[PDB]
mmCIF file of C-alpha atoms and ligand atoms in Angstrom:
data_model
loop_
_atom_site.group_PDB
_atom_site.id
_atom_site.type_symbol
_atom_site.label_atom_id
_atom_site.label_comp_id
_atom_site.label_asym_id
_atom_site.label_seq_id
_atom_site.Cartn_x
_atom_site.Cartn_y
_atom_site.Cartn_z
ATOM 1 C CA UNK A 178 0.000 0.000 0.000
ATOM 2 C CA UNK A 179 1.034 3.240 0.509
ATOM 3 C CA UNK A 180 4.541 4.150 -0.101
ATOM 4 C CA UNK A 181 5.339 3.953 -3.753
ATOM 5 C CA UNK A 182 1.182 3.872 -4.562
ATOM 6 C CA UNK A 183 0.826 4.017 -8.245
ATOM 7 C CA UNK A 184 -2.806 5.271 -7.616
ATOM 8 C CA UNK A 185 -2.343 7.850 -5.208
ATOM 9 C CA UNK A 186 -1.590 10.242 -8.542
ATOM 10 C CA UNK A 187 -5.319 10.459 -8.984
ATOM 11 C CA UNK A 188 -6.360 12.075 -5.785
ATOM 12 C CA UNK A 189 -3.687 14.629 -6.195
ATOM 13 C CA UNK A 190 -4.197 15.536 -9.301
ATOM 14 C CA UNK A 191 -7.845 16.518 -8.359
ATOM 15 C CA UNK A 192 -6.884 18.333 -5.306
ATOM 16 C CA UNK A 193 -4.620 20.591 -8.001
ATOM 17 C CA UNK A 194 -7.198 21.114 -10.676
ATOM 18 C CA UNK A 195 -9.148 22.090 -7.289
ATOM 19 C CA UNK A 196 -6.900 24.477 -6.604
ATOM 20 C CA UNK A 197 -6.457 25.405 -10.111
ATOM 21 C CA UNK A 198 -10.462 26.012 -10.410
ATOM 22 C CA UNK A 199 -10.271 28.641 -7.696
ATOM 23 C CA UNK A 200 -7.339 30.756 -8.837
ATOM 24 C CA UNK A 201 -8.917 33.850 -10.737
ATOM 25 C CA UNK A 202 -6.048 33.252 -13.763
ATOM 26 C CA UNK A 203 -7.794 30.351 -14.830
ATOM 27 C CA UNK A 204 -11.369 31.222 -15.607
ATOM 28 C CA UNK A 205 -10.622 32.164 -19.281
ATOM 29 C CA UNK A 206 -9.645 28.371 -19.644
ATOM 30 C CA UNK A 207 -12.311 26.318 -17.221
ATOM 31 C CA UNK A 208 -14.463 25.942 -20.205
ATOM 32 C CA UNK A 209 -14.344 24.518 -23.639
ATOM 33 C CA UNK A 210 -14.021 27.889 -26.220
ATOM 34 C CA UNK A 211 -17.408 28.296 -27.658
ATOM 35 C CA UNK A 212 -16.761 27.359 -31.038
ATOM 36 C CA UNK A 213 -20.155 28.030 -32.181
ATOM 37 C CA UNK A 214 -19.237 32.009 -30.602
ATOM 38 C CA UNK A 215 -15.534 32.056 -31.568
ATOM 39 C CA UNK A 216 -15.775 31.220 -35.313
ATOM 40 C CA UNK A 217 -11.659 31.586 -36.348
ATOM 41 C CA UNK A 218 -10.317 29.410 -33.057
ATOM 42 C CA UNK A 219 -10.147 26.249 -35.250
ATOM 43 C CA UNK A 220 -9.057 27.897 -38.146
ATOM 44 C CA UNK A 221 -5.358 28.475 -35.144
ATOM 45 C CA UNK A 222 -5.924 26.031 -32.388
ATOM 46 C CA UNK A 223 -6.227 21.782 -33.703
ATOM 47 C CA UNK A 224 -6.740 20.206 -30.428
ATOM 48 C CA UNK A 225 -8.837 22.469 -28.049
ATOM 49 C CA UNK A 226 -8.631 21.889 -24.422
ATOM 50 C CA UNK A 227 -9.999 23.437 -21.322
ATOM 51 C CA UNK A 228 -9.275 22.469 -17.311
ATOM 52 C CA UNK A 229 -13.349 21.176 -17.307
ATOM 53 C CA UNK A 230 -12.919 18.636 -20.042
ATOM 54 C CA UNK A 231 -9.086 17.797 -18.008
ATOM 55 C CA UNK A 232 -11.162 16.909 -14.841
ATOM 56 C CA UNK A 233 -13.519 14.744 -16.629
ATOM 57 C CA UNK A 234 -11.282 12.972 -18.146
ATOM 58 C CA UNK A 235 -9.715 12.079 -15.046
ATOM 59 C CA UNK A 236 -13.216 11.275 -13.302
ATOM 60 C CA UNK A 237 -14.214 8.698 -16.222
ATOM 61 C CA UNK A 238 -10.394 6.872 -15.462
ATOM 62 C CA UNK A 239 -9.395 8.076 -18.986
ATOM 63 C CA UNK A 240 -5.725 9.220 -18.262
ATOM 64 C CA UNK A 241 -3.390 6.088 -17.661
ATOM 65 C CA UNK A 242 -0.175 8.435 -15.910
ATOM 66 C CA UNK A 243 -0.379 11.417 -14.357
ATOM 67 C CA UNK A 244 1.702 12.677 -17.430
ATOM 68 C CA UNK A 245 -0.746 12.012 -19.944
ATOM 69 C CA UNK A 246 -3.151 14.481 -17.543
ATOM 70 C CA UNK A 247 0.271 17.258 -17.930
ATOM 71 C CA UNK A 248 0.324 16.459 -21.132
ATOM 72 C CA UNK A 249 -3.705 17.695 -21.770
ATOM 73 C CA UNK A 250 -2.888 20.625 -18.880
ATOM 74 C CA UNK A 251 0.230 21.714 -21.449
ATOM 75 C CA UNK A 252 -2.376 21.888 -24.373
ATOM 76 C CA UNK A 253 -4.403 24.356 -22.963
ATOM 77 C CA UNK A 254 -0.645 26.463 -21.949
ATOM 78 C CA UNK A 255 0.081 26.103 -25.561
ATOM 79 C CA UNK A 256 -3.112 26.660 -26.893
ATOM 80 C CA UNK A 257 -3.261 29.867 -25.362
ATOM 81 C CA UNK A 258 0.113 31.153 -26.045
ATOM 82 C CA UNK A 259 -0.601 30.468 -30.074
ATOM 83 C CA UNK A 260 -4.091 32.056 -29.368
ATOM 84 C CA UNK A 261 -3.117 35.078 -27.385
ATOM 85 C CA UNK A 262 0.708 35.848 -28.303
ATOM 86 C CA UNK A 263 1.566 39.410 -27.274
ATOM 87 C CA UNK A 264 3.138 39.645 -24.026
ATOM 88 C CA UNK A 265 1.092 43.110 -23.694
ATOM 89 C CA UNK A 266 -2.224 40.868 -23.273
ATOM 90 C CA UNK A 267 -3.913 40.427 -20.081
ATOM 91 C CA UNK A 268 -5.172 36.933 -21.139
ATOM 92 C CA UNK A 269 -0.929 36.252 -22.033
ATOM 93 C CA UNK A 270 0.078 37.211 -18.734
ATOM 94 C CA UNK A 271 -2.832 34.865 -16.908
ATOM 95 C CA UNK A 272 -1.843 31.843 -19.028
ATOM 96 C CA UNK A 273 1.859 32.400 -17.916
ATOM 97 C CA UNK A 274 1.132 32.983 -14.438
ATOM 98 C CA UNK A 275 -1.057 29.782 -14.397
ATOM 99 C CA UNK A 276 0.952 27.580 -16.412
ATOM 100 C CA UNK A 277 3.722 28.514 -13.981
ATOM 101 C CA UNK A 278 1.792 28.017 -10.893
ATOM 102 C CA UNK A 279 0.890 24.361 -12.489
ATOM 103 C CA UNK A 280 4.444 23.726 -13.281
ATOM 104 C CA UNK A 281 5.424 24.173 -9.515
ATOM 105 C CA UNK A 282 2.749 21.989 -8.036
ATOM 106 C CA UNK A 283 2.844 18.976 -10.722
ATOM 107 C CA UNK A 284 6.286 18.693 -10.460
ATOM 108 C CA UNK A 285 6.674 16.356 -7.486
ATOM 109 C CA UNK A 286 3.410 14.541 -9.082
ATOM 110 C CA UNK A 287 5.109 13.231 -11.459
ATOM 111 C CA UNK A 288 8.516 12.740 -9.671
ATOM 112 C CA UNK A 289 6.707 10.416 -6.812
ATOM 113 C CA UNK A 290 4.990 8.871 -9.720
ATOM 114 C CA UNK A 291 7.861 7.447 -11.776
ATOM 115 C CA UNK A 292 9.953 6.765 -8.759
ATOM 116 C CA UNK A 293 7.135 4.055 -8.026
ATOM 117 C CA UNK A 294 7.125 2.864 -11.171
ATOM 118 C CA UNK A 295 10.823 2.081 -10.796
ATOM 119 C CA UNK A 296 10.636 0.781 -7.793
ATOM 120 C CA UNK A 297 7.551 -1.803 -8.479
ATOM 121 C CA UNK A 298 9.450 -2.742 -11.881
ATOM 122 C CA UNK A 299 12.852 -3.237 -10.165
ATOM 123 C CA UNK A 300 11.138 -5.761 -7.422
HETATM 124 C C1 LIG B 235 -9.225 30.447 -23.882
HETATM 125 C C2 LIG B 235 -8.955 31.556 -24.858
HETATM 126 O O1 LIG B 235 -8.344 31.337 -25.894
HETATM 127 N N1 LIG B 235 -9.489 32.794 -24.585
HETATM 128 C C3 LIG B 235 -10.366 33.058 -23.450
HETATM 129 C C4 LIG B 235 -9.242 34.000 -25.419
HETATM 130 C C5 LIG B 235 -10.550 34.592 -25.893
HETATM 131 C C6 LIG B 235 -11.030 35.836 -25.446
HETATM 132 CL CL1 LIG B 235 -10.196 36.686 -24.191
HETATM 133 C C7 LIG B 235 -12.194 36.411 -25.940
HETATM 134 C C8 LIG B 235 -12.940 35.730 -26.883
HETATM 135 C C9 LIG B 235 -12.535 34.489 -27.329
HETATM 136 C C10 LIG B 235 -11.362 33.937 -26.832
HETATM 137 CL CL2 LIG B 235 -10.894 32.357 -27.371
HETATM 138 MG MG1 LIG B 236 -6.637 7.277 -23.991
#
């Protein structure tokens, strides 16, 4: 059980997205973009992502590694960035801030993560 848990992943990533849900820098991103409203965002952005459709994915046991959830978290970092370029931009300097905040609090996510998967495959 609980040292070197390859589950325990889960639970923390939905205590970050919690976190991340709260934190005023990522409302612009909680939601898919309304495509319907927003009628050139898939003539920039291929693979749209949003932190709602991140958490759901994660409820219905559809990531298999915490770093195929960073990887989807990532998207939305890009997504904006190719979106909303100018470092002048509001919406820029939210994305930044967030992604950076993420960045931090992932990090030992994944580092417990793989060190359990090294340990399990080594005995
Ligand atoms: C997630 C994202 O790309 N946003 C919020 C930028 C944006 C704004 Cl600020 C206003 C209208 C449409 C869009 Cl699409
Ligand atoms: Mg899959």
């Amino acid at each position: 059980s609980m040292s070197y848990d390859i589950q325990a992943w889960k639970k923390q990533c939905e205590e970050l997205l919690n976190l991340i849900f709260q934190c005023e820098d990522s409302e612009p991103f909680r939601q898919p973009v309304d495509l319907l409203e927003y009628p050139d965002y898939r003539d920039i952005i291929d693979t749209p992502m949003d932190f709602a459709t991140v958490r759901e994915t994660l409820e219905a046991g559809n990531y298999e590694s915490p770093m195929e959830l960073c990887k989807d978290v990532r998207l939305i970092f890009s997504n904006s960035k190719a979106y909303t370029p100018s470092k002048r931009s509001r919406i820029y300097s939210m994305s930044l801030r967030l992604s950076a905040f993420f960045e931090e609090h992932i990090s030992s996510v994944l580092s417990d993560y793989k060190s359990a998967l090294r340990f399990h495959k080594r005995n």
